[PDB]
Design a protein around this ligand. Structure first.
Ligand SMILES: O=c1[nH][nH]c2cc(Nc3ncc(Nc4ccccc4)c(Nc4cc(C5CC5)n[nH]4)n3)ccc12
Length: 334
C-alpha cells in the first residue's frame, strides 16, 4: 500500500480509486482537488468537507447531498460518488466526487472578455438550471460566478447547494430584501448581478460591508419609493435608508453603453428593488434577449417539489452525523 493521500499537509484519503491529486482551492471547512479515477479513467472533482464541529455545517452538508442526489439536470452538478470512513466513530470528513469542469465563471471573467452571444448562452443555461431548481420549490440562495462551472464547449453547470433551502451568502450578489428583512426572487436578483458582471467584467454592486452594499444598489437604482420600503424590514436599515439624501436613477444604457438593448431590458427586470415586481425565471427565459435559445420543449422541470422528511434546523449535530453516515451508506461496498 501507498498509505493515505495528502494535499498541502492535509489528509485527502480518496485512494486507491482516486489518485494523482491536484489542488484547486479551499473554503472555511472544505478543500477541492482534481483526481484521476482509475475505474472510469477520467479526471474528477473531489470536495473534502469537515463539518462535524458545527450543527449548521452538518445541516448544509446533508441538504446538499440530499438535494444533488435527487436532482437530475444538464445545468446542475451531480454527485457521482461519496467517500467517508467505515464507522461513524472514525468519520471526521466527507468527500463528494463530482464531474470535473474546465473552470468557473469567476476565473473566466478575470481573464476573458465575453461576446454578446456567449453572455446570452451562459445566461440561458443559468436560467434553464434555475427553472428546474425553482420548479422543485428550492432556492439556491448563493448564485455567484464562482458557483457556475464551465467546460471547453461552453456548457454550464450550477454547483454548491450547501445554502439551498425549500421555499448568509456573498454580499455582492445578495438581494436587498435579505439585507432589509427569503423567496425565489432572491435567486433572480443574483442572476441579474451575474449578467451585469458578464457585460462589464466588473461586479455591479461591490460593497465592502452591508451598508456599502445598500449604498451601491441605491447609487444605480436611485432612492427607493414608499412602496419599495413598505415591507417587513428591520428598523435600523429603514431608518438608515430614510436618513440618506436623494439619489438619482442611473439609466442602464449609461452604465453599460455598448450592451445589447434587449440584455439591458432583461437586466432592468431582474435588478428590480421590490421582489414582487421582479421578473420570474420562466418570464426571464421567454424574454426577447434569450429568443435564439429559448426552447420550452427542452427545459425540464422536477416531477415533484423537494421536501425534507425531518426538521433539520432542530436536530443536534450528533443526530445529523448519523443521518449523514446513513445517507452516504449506498456508496459503500455492499
Ligand atoms: O464547491 C465549489 N463551489 N464553487 C466552486 C468553485 C470551484 N472552481 C473551479 N475552478 C476551476 C475548475 N477546473 C479546473 C480544471 C483543471 C485544473 C484546475 C481547475 C473547477 N472544476 C470543478 C469543480 C467541480 C465541483 C464543484 C466541485 N467540478 N469541477 N472548479 C471549485 C469548487 C467549487
Amino acid at each position: 500500500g501507498a498509505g493515505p493521500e495528502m494535499v498541502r499537509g492535509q489528509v485527502f484519503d480518496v485512494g486507491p480509486r482516486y489518485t494523482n491529486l491536484s489542488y484547486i482551492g479551499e473554503g472555511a471547512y472544505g478543500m477541492v482537488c482534481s483526481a484521476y479515477d482509475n475505474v472510469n479513467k477520467v479526471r474528477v472533482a473531489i470536495k473534502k468537507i469537515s463539518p462535524f464541529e458545527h450543527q449548521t455545517y452538518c445541516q448544509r452538508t446533508l441538504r446538499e447531498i440530499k438535494i444533488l442526489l435527487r436532482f437530475r439536470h444538464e445545468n446542475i452538478i451531480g454527485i457521482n460518488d461519496i467517500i467517508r470512513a467505515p464507522t461513524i466513530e472514525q468519520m471526521k470528513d466527507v468527500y463528494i466526487v463530482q464531474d470535473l469542469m474546465e473552470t468557473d465563471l469567476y476565473k473566466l471573467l478575470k481573464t476573458q472578455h465575453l461576446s454578446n452571444d456567449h453572455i446570452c448562452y451562459f445566461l440561458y443555461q443559468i436560467l434553464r438550471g434555475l427553472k428546474y431548481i425553482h420548479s422543485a420549490n428550492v432556492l439556491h440562495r448563493d448564485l455567484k460566478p464562482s458557483n457556475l462551472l464551465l467546460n471547453t464547449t461552453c456548457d454550464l453547470k450550477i454547483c454548491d447547494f450547501g445554502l439551498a433551502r425549500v421555499a448568509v451568502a456573498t454580499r455582492w450578489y445578495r438581494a436587498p430584501e435579505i439585507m432589509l428583512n427569503y423567496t425565489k426572487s432572491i435567486d433572480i436578483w443574483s442572476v441579474g448581478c451575474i449578467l451585469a458582471e458578464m457585460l462589464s467584467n466588473r461586479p455591479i454592486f461591490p460593497g465592502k460591508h452591508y451598508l456599502d452594499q445598500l449604498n451601491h444598489i441605491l447609487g444605480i437604482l436611485g432612492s427607493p419609493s414608499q412602496e419599495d420600503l413598505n415591507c417587513i424590514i428591520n428598523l435600523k436599515a429603514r431608518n438608515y435608508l430614510l436618513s440618506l439624501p436623494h439619489k438619482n436613477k442611473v439609466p442602464w444604457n449609461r452604465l453599460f453603453p455598448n450592451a445589447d438593448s434587449k440584455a439591458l431590458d432583461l437586466l432592468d427586470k431582474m435588478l428590480t428593488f421590490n421582489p414582487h415586481k421582479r421578473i420570474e425565471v420562466e418570464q426571464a427565459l421567454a424574454h426577447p434577449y434569450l429568443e435564439q435559445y429559448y426552447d420550452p420543449s427542452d427545459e425540464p422541470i422536477a416531477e415533484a417539489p423537494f421536501k425534507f422528511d425531518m426538521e433539520l434546523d432542530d436536530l443536534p449535530k450528533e443526530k445529523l452525523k448519523e443521518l449523514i453516515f446513513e445517507e452516504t451508506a449506498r456508496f459503500q461496498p455492499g
